[PDB]
Coordinates of C-alpha atoms in Angstrom, one line a residue:
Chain A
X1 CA 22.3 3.0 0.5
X2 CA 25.4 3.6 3.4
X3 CA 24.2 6.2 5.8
X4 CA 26.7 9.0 6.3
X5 CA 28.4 9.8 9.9
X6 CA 25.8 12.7 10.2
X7 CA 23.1 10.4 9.0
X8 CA 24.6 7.5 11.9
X9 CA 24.8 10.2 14.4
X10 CA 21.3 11.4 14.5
X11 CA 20.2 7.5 14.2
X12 CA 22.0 7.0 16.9
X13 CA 20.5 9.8 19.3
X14 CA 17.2 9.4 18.1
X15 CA 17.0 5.9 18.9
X16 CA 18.1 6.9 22.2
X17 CA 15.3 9.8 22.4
X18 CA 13.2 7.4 21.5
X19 CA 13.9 4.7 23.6
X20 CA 14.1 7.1 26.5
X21 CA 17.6 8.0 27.3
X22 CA 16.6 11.3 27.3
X23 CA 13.5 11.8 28.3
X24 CA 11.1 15.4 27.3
X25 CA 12.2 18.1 28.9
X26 CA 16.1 17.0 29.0
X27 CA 18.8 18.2 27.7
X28 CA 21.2 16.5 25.8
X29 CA 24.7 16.3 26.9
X30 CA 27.6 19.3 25.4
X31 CA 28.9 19.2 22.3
X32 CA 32.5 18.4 23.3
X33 CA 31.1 15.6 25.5
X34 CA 28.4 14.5 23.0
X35 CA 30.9 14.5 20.2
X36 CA 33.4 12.4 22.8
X37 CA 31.2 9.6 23.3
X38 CA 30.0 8.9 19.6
X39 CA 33.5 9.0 18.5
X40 CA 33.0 11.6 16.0
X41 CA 34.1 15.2 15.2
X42 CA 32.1 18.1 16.5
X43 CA 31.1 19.2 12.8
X44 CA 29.4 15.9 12.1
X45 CA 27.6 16.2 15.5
X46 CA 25.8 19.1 14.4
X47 CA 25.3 18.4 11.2
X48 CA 23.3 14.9 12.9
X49 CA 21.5 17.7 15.1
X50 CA 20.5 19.5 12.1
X51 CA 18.7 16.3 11.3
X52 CA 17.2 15.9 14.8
X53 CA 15.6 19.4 14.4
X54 CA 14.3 19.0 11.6
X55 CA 13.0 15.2 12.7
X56 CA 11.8 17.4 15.4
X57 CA 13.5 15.5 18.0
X58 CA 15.3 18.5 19.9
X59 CA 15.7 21.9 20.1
X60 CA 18.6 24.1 20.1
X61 CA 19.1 26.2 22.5
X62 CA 20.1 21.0 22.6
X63 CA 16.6 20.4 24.6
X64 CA 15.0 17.1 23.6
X65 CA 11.1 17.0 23.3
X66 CA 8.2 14.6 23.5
X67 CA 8.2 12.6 20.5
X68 CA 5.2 11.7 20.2
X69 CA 4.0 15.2 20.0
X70 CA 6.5 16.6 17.6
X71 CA 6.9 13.3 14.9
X72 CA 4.8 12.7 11.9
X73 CA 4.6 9.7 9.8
X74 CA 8.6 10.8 9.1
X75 CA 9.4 8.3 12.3
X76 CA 7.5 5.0 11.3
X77 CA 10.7 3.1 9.5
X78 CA 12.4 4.1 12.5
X79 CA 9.3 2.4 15.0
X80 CA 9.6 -0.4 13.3
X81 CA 13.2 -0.6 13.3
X82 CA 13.7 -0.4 16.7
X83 CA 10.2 -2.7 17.2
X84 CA 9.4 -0.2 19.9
X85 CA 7.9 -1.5 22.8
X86 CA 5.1 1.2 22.5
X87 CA 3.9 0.0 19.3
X88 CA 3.4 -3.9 19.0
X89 CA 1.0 -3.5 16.4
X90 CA 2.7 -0.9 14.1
X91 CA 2.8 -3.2 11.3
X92 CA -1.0 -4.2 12.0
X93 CA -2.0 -0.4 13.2
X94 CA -0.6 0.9 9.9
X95 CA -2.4 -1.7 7.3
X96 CA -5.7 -0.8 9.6
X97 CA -4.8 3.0 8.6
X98 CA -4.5 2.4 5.1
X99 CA -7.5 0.8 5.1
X100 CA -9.7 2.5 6.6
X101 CA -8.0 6.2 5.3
X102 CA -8.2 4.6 1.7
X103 CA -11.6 4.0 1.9
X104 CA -12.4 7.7 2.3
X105 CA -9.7 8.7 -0.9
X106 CA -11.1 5.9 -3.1
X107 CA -14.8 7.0 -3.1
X108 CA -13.6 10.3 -3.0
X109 CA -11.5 9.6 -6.6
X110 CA -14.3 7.6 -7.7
X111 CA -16.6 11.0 -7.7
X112 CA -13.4 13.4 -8.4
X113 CA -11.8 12.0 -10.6
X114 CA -12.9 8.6 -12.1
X115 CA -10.4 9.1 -15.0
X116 CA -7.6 9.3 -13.2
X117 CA -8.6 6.6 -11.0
X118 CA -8.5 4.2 -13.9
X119 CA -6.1 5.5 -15.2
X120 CA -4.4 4.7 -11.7
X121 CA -5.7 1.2 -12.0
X122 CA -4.9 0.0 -15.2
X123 CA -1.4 -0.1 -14.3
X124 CA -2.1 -3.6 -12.5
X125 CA -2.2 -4.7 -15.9
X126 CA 1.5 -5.9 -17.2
X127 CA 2.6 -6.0 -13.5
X128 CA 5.8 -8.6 -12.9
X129 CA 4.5 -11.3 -10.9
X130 CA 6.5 -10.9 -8.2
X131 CA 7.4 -9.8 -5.0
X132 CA 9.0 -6.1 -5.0
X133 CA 6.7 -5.4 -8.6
X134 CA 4.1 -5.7 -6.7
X135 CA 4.5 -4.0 -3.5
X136 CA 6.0 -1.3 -6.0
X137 CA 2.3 -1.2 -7.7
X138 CA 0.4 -1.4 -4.8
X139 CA 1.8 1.6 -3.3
X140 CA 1.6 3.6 -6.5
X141 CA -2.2 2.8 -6.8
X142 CA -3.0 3.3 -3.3
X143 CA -1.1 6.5 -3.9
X144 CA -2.3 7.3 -6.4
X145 CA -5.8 6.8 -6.0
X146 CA -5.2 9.1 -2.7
X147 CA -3.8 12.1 -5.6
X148 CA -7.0 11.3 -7.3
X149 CA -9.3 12.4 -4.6
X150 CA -8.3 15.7 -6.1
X151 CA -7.2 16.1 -2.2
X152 CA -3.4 16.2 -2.1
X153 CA -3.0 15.9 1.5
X154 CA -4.5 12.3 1.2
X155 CA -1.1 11.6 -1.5
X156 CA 1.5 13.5 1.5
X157 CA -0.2 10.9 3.8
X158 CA 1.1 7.8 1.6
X159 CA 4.2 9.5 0.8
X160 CA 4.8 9.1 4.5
X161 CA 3.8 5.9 4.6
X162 CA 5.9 4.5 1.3
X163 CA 8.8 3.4 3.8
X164 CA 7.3 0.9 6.0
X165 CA 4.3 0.3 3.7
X166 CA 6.5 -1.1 0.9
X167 CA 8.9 -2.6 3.3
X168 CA 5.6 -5.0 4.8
X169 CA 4.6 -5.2 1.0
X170 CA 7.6 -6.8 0.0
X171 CA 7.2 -9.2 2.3
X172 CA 3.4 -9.9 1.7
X173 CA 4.0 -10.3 -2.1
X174 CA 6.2 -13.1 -2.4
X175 CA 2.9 -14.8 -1.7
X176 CA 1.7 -15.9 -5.0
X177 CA -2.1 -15.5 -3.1
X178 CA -0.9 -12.4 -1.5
X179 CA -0.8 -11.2 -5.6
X180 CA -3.8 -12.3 -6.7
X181 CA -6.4 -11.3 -4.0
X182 CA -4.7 -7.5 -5.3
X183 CA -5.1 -8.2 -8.6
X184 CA -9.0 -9.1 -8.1
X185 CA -9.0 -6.3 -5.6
X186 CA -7.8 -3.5 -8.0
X187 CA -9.9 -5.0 -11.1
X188 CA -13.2 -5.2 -8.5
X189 CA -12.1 -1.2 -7.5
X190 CA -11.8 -0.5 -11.5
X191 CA -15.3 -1.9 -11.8
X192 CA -17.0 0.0 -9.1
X193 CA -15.3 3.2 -10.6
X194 CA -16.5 2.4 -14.1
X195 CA -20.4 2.1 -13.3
X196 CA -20.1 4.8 -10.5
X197 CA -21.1 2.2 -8.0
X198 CA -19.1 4.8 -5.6
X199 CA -21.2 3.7 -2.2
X200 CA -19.7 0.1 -2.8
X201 CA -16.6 1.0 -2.3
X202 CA -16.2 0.9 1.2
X203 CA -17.5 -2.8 1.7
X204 CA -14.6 -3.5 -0.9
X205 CA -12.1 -1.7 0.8
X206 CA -13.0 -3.1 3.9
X207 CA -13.7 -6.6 2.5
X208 CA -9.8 -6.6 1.3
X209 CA -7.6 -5.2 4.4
X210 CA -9.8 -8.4 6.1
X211 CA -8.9 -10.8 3.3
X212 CA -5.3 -9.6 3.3
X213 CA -4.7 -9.5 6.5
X214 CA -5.8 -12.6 7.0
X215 CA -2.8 -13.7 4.9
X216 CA -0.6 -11.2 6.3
X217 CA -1.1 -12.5 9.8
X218 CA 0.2 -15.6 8.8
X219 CA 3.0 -14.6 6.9
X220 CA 4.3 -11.8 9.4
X221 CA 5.1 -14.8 12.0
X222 CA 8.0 -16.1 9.9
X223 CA 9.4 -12.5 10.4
X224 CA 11.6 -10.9 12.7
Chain B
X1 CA 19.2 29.7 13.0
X2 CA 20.8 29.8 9.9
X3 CA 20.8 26.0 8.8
X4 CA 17.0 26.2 9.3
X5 CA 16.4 29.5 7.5
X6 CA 18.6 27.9 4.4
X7 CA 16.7 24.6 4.4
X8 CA 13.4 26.6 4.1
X9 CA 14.9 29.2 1.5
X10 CA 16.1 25.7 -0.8
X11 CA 12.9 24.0 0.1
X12 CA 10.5 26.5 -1.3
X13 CA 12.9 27.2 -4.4
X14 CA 12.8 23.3 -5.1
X15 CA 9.1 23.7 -4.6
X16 CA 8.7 26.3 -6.8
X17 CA 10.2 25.1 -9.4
X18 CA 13.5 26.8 -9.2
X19 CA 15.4 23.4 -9.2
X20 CA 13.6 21.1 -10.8
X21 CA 13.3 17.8 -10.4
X22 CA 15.8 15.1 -11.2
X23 CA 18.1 18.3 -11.4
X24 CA 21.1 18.2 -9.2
X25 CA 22.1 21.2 -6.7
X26 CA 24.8 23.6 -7.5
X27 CA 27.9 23.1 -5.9
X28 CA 27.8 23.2 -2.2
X29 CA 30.3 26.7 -2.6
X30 CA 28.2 28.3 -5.2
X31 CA 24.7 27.8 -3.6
X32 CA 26.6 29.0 -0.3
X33 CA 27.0 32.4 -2.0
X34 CA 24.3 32.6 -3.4
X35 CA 22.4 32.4 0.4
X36 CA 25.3 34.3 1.5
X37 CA 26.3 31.5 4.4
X38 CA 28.7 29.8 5.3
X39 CA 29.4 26.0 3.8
X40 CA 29.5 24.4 6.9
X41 CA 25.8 26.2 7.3
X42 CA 24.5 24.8 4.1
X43 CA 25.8 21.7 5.0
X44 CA 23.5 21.5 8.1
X45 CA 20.8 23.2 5.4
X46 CA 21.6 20.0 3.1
X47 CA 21.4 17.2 6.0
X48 CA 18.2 19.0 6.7
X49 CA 17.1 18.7 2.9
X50 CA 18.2 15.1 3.2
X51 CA 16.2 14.2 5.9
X52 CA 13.0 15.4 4.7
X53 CA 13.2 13.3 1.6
X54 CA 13.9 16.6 -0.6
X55 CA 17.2 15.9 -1.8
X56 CA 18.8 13.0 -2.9
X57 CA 22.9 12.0 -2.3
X58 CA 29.6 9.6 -5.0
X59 CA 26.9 12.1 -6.9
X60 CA 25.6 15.0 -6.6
X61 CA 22.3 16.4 -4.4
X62 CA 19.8 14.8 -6.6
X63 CA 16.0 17.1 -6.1
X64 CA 13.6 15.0 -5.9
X65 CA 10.0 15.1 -7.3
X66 CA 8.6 17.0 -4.2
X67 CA 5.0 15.3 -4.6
X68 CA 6.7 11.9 -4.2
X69 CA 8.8 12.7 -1.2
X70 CA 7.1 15.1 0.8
X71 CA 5.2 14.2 4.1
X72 CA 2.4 16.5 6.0
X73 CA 5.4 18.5 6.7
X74 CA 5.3 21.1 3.8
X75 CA 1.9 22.3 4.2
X76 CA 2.7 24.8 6.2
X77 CA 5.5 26.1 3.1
X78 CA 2.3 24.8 0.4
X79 CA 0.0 27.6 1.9
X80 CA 3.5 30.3 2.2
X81 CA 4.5 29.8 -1.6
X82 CA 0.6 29.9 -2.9
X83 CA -1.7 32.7 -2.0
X84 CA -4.6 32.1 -4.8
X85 CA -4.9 28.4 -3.2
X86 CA -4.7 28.5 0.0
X87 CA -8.3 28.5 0.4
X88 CA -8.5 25.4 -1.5
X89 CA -5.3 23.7 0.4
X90 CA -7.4 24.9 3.6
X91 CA -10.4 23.1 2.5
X92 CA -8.3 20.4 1.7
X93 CA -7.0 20.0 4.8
X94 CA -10.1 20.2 7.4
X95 CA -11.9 18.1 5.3
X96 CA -8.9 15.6 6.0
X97 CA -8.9 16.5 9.5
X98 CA -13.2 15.8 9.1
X99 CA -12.8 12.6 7.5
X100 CA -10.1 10.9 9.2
X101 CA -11.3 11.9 12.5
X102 CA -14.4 10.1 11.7
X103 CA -12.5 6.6 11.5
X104 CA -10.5 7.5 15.4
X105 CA -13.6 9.1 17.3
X106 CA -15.0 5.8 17.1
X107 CA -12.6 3.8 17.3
X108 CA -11.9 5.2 20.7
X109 CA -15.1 6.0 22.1
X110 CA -15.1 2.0 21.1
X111 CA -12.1 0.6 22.4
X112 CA -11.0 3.9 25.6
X113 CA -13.9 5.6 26.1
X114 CA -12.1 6.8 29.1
X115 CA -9.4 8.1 27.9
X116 CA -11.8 10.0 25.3
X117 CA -13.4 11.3 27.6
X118 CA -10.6 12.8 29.6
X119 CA -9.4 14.2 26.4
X120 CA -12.9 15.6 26.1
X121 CA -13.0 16.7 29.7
X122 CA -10.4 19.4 28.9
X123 CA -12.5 21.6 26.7
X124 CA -14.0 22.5 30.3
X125 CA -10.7 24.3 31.1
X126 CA -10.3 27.0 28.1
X127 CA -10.2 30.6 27.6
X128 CA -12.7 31.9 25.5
X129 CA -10.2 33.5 22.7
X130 CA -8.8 32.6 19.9
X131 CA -5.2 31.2 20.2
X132 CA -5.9 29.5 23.4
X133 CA -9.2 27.2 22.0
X134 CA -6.7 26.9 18.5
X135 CA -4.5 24.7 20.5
X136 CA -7.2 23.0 22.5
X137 CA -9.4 22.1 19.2
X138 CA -6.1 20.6 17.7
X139 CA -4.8 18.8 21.2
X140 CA -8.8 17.6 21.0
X141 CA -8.5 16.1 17.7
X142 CA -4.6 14.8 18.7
X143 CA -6.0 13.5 21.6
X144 CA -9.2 11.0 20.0
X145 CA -6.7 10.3 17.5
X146 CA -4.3 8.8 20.2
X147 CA -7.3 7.5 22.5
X148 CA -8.3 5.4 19.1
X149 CA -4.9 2.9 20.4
X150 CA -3.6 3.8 17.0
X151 CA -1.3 5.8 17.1
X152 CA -0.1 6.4 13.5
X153 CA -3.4 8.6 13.6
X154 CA -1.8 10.8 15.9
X155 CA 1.1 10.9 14.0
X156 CA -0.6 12.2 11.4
X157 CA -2.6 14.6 13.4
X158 CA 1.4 15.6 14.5
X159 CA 1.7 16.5 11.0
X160 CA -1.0 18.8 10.6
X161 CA -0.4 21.1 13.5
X162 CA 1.3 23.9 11.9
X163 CA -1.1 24.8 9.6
X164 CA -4.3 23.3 10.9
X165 CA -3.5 25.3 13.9
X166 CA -2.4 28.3 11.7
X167 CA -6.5 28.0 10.6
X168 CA -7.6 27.5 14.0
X169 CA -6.0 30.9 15.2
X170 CA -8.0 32.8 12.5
X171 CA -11.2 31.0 12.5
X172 CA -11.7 30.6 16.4
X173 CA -11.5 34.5 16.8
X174 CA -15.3 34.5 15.9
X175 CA -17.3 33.9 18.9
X176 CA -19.7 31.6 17.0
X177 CA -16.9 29.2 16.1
X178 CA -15.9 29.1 20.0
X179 CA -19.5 28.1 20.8
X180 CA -19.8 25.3 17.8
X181 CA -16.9 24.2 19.1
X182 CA -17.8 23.3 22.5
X183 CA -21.0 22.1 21.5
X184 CA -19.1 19.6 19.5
X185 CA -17.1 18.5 22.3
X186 CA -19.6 18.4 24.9
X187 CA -22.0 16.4 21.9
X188 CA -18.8 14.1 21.2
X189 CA -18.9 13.1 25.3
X190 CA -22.2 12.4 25.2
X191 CA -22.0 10.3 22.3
X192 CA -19.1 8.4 24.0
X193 CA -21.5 8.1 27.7
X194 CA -23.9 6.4 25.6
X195 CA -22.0 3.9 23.5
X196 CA -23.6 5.7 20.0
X197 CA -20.6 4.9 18.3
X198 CA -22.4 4.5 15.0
X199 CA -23.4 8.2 15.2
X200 CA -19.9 9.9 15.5
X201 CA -20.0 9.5 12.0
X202 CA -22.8 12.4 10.9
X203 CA -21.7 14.4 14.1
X204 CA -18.0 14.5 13.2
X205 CA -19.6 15.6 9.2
X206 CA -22.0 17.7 10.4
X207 CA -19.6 20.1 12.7
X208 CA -17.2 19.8 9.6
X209 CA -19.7 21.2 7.1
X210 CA -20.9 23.6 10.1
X211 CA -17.9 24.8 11.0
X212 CA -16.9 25.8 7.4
X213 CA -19.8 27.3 6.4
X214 CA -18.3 29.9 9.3
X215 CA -15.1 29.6 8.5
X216 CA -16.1 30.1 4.5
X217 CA -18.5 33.4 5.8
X218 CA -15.4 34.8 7.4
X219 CA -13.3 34.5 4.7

C-alpha cells in the first residue's frame, strides 16, 4: 500500500512531533520554508497538515500540541514504528490491555449476548492453520466478542487496536503452539458461554494473556 | 476551516448511511459542488477522511464499513447524528470509562502510588462549577490511566474526551455530583495511602452506579 506525498509528509512531521523536534507549545516552521525543506509543493504540505489535524498533532492558526494529550489509539502503529523511547513495552503494554479490557467485554457478551458470542466463536472452526489466518481470527473474535457486549465502544477500542494487534499476531502465529493454545482458548471461552459459567471467565482470560505471553516473550526476541 | 467542516459533513453522511459501504465517492468535482468548496478544500476533507480510516484509496475513494474502521474518535459525531440513543451511547460510555478505570486505578496505586496521588492531589485545586470539575474529573481519570505505566490506557482515555467531557459539563452542574465527586477522589487517595488495592474495584463500581443514578435522575 504506497503512501502518497501528503500521506509521507505528515509521517514525516509527526515523527518529528513525536520525537520532539517540535516540542508543545511550538510552532511549526512557514509554509514556504516547511514546504522548502521536505522538498515538496505547498499544496501537498497542507494537504499532510490536514492529516496532522485531524491526527491531532497541530493546530492551525501551525501550533503543535502535546501528543500525548491529544492522540488516541489512532498513533500506536506509528509508536511502534518509530520504537519510541517512551514506550519499551508497547508491544507488552498493549497485549496487557487486551487482556485485561477483554476480560470485562467477554463476561459482559457472555450475559448480553451469549448468541452472538458463539456465534463469534465458532468461527475458529475451519480456520487456515497458519500464520496471518490466524491473527486474522483472533482479532475478529476478540472484536467481536467486544461488539457482543452489546457495548459498541468496547468494538471502537479494538478497531483501534487492529493495526499493531494484528501486526504482533502475525508474528505470534507462525508458532504452530502459538495456534493451538487459541484454539483451546476460544473452544474453553465457547464452553464457559454455553453453560453460563460467566464468573469463570476472567481466570480464563487471565490464564491465556499469561500462557501466551509466555510464548510471545520468547518469540518477540528474534524481532526487530 | 473548511477542510474540517467538509470532513465532518462526509463523515456523518457515510455514517448515516448516505454512502454506503463498499460504495465509492463521487467524483472529487461533483462532491465539491455539492459542499459548495473548493477541490483543493475537499482534497484536504479527503486526506482527512483517509486518515481516520473512513475512506479507502489507481481507484476510487472506497467507504469503508464505519464499524470496522472507526476509533473512539466518532463518538462525539455517534451522539450528533442520533438523538433517541444518546442516552444509551452515554451509558455506554461511563460504563467503559467505570470498567476500564477499574483495571488502571490499581494498577497504579500498585506500581506509582505517587504519582496517583499527585494526580489525586489536584481535585484540592477546583472551582466548584460545572465546566471547571468536567475537565478535572476527565484529567483525573487521564491521569490514573497514565500513573497505571500503561499508557495505551491513557490513549484511550484521549479518545473519550470529547464526549465524556461533553457528559461531564451537564452532569457536574448538580451540586450533588460535585460533592460525589470529591468524595471519590479523596476515597481513591485513601485507598492508595493504604495499599487497599484489592478494594478499588467496588469503589471505582460503586461511584459508577452512584453517580448515574444522578446523572439518570437529571435526565
Amino acid at each position: 500500500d504506497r503512501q502518497r506525498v501528503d500521506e509521507r509528509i505528515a509521517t514525516t512531521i509527526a515523527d518529528a512531533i513525536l520525537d520532539g523536534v517540535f516540542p508543545p507549545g511550538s510552532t511549526l516552521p512557514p509554509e514556504r520554508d516547511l514546504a522548502e525543506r521536505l522538498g515538496v509543493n505547498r499544496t501537498s504540505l497542507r494537504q499532510g497538515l490536514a492529516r496532522l489535524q485531524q491526527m491531532g498533532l497541530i493546530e492551525v492558526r501551525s501550533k503543535v500540541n502535546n501528543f500525548w494529550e491529544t492522540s488516541g489509539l489512532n498513533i500506536l502503529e506509528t509508536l511502534a514504528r518509530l520504537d519510541h523511547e517512551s514506550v519499551p513495552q508497547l508491544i507488552d503494554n498493549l497485549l496487557s490491555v487486551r487482556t485485561n479490557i477483554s476480560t470485562i467485554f467477554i463476561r459482559t457478551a457472555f450475559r448480553q449476548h451469549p448468541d452472538k458470542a458463539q456465534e463469534v466463536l465458532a468461527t475458529a472452526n475451519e480456520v487456515a492453520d497458519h500464520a496471518d489466518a490466524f491473527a486474522e481470527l483472533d482479532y475478529n473474535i476478540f472484536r467481536g466478542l467486544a461488539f457482543a457486549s452489546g457495548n459498541p465502544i468496547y468494538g471502537l477500542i479494538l478497531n483501534g487496536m487492529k493495526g499493531l494487534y494484528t501486526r504482533i499476531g502475525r508474528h505470534y502465529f507462525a508458532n504452530p503452539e502459538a495456534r493451538s493454545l487459541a484454539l483451546g482458548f476460544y473452544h474453553k471461552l465457547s464452553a464457559l458461554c454455553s453453560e453460563g459459567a460467566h464468573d469463570q471467565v476472567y481466570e480464563t482470560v487471565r490464564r491465556y494473556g499469561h500462557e501466551s505471553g509466555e510464548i510471545w516473550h520468547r518469540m518477540q526476541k528474534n524481532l526487530p
